[PDB]
């Protein structure tokens, strides 16, 4: 049972226009925010990955916050891909968006809390690391402490204050595992955009879907192959479009008949962001 006629972006569009495609799940990564200024991935780091590991951070938080001040974007504008997911929401096709990103650009693009599984948390809020305190601090307080180059400390504990990001070594939120149990029994299409499926347990999500569910990858490189089956003789459902995410979403929107909708959405929302 192959639900796609051709293993191409146009085949995915035609399948999305059929009545079988009612519930679409988006799995997105850093590649969908690179065109917005968010980057992809002296202090003597024992290994460069320790900058995002919770044990080292609790021991030595200065490198992380220095990097945060260095790479903090001056503006937060969602990309064409974010607004493609917004169009999916507006048309009743988006069951869920699982994101590895912490830039909150899905929220700014208009996806509500129920639409989202922020699998790796958010930079928007921060908390005291003491579990008996958990004093919450907003992004303004955190950004002030980051740019004044003062290590964020709790007013009650004097303990370290960490942004609500799932560092390497921390458990994912329970909402991830609650949504996953229900969402993938009913999913009709997987849209994997801007991720090379290198972080677990997020990557495993691509194997939770039913075997007949088509899966489209829009990414600068093929990924998730054993599993993704793009280029074998047994291939029947996995399509790979290689390039920038904005270009792939433009092409898919045009093939679906939504070119002008996506253009208007992007223009108006960017104007509204520049207005405030």
């Amino acid at each position: 049972e192959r639900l796609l006629d051709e293993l191409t972006l146009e085949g995915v569009a035609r399948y999305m226009q059929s009545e079988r495609c009612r519930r679409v799940i988006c799995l997105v990564g850093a590649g969908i925010s690179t065109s917005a200024g968010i980057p992809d991935f002296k202090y003597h780091l024992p290994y460069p990955e320790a900058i995002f590991e919770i044990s080292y951070f609790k021991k030595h938080p200065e490198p992380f916050f220095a990097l945060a001040k260095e790479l903090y974007p001056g503006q937060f504008k969602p990309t064409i891909c974010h607004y493609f997911m917004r169009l999916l929401k507006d048309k009743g096709l988006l069951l869920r968006c699982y994101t590895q990103n912490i830039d909150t650009l899905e929220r700014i693009a208009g996806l509500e809390q129920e639409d989202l599984v922020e699998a790796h948390g958010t930079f928007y809020t921060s908390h005291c690391v003491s579990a008996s305190c958990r004093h919450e601090y907003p992004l303004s307080w955190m950004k002030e402490k980051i740019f004044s180059e003062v290590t964020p400390k709790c007013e009650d504990c004097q303990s370290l204050v960490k942004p609500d990001i799932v560092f390497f070594g921390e458990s994912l939120p329970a909402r991830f595992f609650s949504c996953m149990q229900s969402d993938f029994l009913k999913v009709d299409l997987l849209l994997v955009m801007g991720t090379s499926l290198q972080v677990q347990p997020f990557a495993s999500l691509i194997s939770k879907a039913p075997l007949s569910t088509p899966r489209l990858l829009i990414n600068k490189e093929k990924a998730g192959q054993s599993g993704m089956d793009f280029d074998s003789k047994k291939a029947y459902r996995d399509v790979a479009w290689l390039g920038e995410c904005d270009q792939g979403c433009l092409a898919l929107a045009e093939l679906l008949g939504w070119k002008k909708e996506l253009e208007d959405l992007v223009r108006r929302e960017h104007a509204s962001i520049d207005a405030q």
């Binding site: 799932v166 070594g169 458990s171 290198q198 677990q200 347990p201």
Partner: peptide, 8 residues
């Protein structure tokens, strides 16, 4: 003991 953790 804990929920699955973010690993590379």
């Amino acid at each position: 003991e804990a929920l699955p953790k973010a690993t590379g």
